[PDB]
Amino acid sequence: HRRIHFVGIGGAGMCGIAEVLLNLGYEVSGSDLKASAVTERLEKFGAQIFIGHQAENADGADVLVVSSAINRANPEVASALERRIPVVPRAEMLAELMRYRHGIAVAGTHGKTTTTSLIASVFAAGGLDPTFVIGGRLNAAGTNAQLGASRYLVAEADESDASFLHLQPMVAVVTNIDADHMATYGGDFNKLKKTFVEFLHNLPFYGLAVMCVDDPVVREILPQIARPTVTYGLSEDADVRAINIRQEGMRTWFTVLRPEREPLDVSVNMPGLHNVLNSLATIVIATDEGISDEAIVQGLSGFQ
Ligand SMILES: Cn1nc(Nc2nc(N[C@@H](CO)c3ccccc3)nc3[nH]ncc23)cc1C(C)(C)C
Numbered sequence: 001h002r003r004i005h006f007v008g009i010g011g012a013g014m015c016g017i018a019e020v021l022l023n024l025g026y027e028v029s030g031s032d033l034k035a036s037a038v039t040e041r042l043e044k045f046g047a048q049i050f051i052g053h054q055a056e057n058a059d060g061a062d063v064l065v066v067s068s069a070i071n072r073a074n075p076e077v078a079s080a081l082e083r084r085i086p087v088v089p090r091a092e093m094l095a096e097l098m099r100y101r102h103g104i105a106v107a108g109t110h111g112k113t114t115t116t117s118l119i120a121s122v123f124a125a126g127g128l129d130p131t132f133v134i135g136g137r138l139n140a141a142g143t144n145a146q147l148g149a150s151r152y153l154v155a156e157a158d159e160s161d162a163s164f165l166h167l168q169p170m171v172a173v174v175t176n177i178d179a180d181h182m183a184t185y186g187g188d189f190n191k192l193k194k195t196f197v198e199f200l201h202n203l204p205f206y207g208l209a210v211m212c213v214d215d216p217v218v219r220e221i222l223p224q225i226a227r228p229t230v231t232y233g234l235s236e237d238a239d240v241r242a243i244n245i246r247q248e249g250m251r252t253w254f255t256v257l258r259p260e261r262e263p264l265d266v267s268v269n270m271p272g273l274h275n276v277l278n279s280l281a282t283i284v285i286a287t288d289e290g291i292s293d294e295a296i297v298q299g300l301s302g303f304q
C-alpha cells in the first residue's frame with residue numbers, strides 16, 4: 001500500500017499525520033470542505049488536495065483515514081467501502097507512525113501530557129528535534145521542517161484509546177495506573193491492570209520499561225514485566241530518585257540520583273511533587289538514550 005487518502009485532511013488531528021506520511025515517502029491525498037493554510041502547506045510538501053467530497057477523490061487510494069467513525073454518508077468513504085479499500089480511524093494511523101521511528105510511549109493515567117512535553121524539551125535541548133504527540137496533535141519545535149523528520153517520536157499512550165495495545169515503542173513510561181477509564185475494561189480494575197502488563201509486553205526484549213514505583217499499582221505489576229526496566233520515584237528503593245527537594249519561587253530544585261552516576265542538581269519551573277515525578281521519568285529516558293547532563297538540565301529548566 002502506497003497512497004493514503006485523508007477525509008477531512010485539514011482537520012487538526014489529520015494534517016500532522018498526513019505530513020509525517022509525506023516525510024516517510026508515501027503518496028498522500030486528502031479532501032476538505034474549505035481550502036486553508038494547512039492544506040496549502042501540505043500541498044507544498046507533496047499532498048494532492050481535493051476541495052469538496054466526491055467519490056472520485058478516493059480513486060487510487062490504498063487506504064482511507066477518517067476523522068472520527070466511519071460515517072458512510074460521505075461518498076468517498078462509501079466508495080472505498082464498496083471497493084474493499086480499508087478505512088482506518090485517525091487514532092490508529094497516528095499510533096502506527098511509531099513503527100517507523102524510535103518511539104517513546106508515555107503511558108499512565110495522569111501526567112502523560114507534561115511528561116511528553118518534558119521529554120520533547122530535553123531531547124530538543126540535545127539537538128534531536130523530536131516529533132511529539134499531545135492530545136492527538138503532532139508537534140515539533142522547528143516550524144519549517146516536516147513533522148517526523150527526527151529519528152524520535154514521543155507520544156502519549158492513552159489506556160482508553162482503541163489503539164493502546166497496537167503501539168510499537170522502543171521505550172515505554174508508566175507514570176501511574178488509576179481507575180478513570182475502568183469503563184473501557186468492563187468496569188473492572190483488575191482487567192485494567194492486566195492491560196498495562198500487555199502494553200509493556202509490546203516492547204521488544206531490547207526495549208526499556210520506565211516504571212514509577214511510587215504508584216502502588218505500578219509497583220504491584222512490576223515483577224510481571226519480562227523486559228528491561230528502570231524504576232523511578234521518591235521511594236528510597238527506586239533506581240532513579242529525587243532527594244533534597246526545595247523551592248526558590250515557582251521553581252522546584254532537586255538532586256536526582258542515578259545508578260553509576262554522580263548526583264545531579266536539576267530544577268523545573270513548575271511546582272508539586274507530580275512535576276518532580278514528570279522530571280524523573282524524563283531524566284530516565286534521556287539518560288538511557290545517552291543525552292548529556294547539560295541538555296537534561298537545560299531542557300528541564302527552560303520548560304515553560
Ligand atoms: C500534570 N500532572 N502530572 C502528573 N504526573 C504524575 N502524577 C502521578 N501521580 C498523581 C496521582 O496519582 C500525583 C498527583 C499529585 C501528587 C503526586 C502524584 N504520578 C506520576 N509518576 N510520574 C509522573 C506522574 C499528574 C498531573 C495532574 C493532572 C494530576 C496534576
Ligand SMILES: [Cl-]
Pocket residue numbers: 085086087088
Ligand atoms: Cl474498513
